């Protein structure tokens, strides 16, 4: 929905409905957002504000960017 009402975001990649391209937002009610549009947003907000990261969130910048660079989009048919 909007991130005024967003608390947890799950990125399960093996035992979910379909795979990495689905990621469930929730707050309780849950949603079914887009996979490569939440991962490709959190890369773009940690890499943008790279002057304030505590040293633990740089591991989030490296995990999300590796997990996004391995998804073959041409096999999403």
């Amino acid at each position, epitope marked *: 929905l909007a991130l005024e009402n967003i608390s947890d975001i799950y990125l399960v990649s093996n035992q979910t409905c379909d*795979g990495f391209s689905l990621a469930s937002l929730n707050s309780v009610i849950s949603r079914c957002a887009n996979g490569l549009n939440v991962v490709s947003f959190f890369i773009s907000i940690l890499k943008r504000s790279s002057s304030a990261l505590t040293g633990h969130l740089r591991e989030l*910048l*490296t995990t999300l960017e*590796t*997990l996004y*660079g391995s*998804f073959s989009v041409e096999d999403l048919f």
Partner: antibody
Framework: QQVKESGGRLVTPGTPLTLTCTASGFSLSTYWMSWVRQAPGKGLEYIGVIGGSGSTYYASWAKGRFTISKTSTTVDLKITSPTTEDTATYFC????????????WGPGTLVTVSS | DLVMTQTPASVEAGVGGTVTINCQASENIGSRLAWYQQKPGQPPKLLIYRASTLESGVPSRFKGSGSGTEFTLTISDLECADAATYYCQCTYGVSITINYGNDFGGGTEVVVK
């Protein structure tokens, strides 16, 4: 699930050689294939990596000389100019998306380069 | 790229002992490491990934520890089938922002007697 690489032969030093690596039994396609080297009796040496999106990276010494390029089902290495010190055994290491657990390793094809 | 000074070159113990391997990354790679185990004439088998998480299939003996710039493996109660070469790999090598390379270690034989 398993990984096999294939194609390595004796070459005249200076004839370009390509090795192929076939992923046989995987279900999801989020992979980071990687090639490593081992000269006979030495430690392992890292060569490069290729993603699913095509994002290729190389090591510091193996820049310019090697080229990793994927296809629909294979991952191809290309040695541009095999010199005499490029004789080794070449492995293929595939994993899941996180890029940290290089779990499946092929048996190895033994490239030898000498006229 | 960074270097991995894997010390020592060859360790030695007996059955029921414990060994230690050290390797020191040149930059703060931050608990992204992996330990392999290559027997003579085999492809390397993964043991520990992310420097403390056992690969599903290894015995409970292998352990790994450390973060920042210094890491260690401590095989314990060395069985007879432990004479192999042990490498440590820095798996910080697939990104565009940091990308600290992916070089292996120097090599350590673990021979029993």
């Amino acid at each position: 699930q398993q990984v096999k690489e294939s194609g390595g032969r004796l070459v005249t030093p200076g004839t370009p050689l390509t090795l192929t690596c076939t992923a046989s039994g995987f279900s999801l396609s989020t992979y980071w294939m990687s090639w490593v080297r081992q000269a006979p009796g030495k430690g392992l040496e890292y060569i490069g990596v290729i993603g699913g999106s095509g994002s290729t990276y190389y090591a510091s010494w193996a820049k310019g000389r090697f080229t990793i390029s994927k296809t629909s089902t294979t991952v191809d290495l290309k040695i541009t100019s095999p010199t005499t010190e490029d004789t080794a055994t070449y492995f293929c290491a595939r994993d899941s998306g996180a890029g940290v657990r290089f779990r499946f390793w092929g048996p190895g094809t033994l490239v030898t380069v000498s006229s | 790229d960074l270097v991995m000074t894997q010390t020592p070159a060859s360790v030695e113990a007996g059955v029921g002992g414990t060994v230690t391997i050290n390797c020191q990354a040149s930059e703060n790679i931050g608990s992204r490491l992996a330990w392999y185990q290559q027997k003579p004439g085999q492809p390397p088998k993964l043991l520990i990934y992310r420097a403390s998480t056992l690969e599903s299939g290894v015995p409970s003996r292998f352990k790994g520890s450390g973060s920042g710039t210094e890491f260690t493996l401590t095989i314990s109660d060395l069985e007879c089938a432990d004479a192999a070469t042990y490498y440590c790999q820095c798996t910080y090598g697939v990104s565009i922002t940091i990308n600290y390379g992916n070089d292996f270690g120097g090599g350590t034989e673990v021979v029993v007697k």
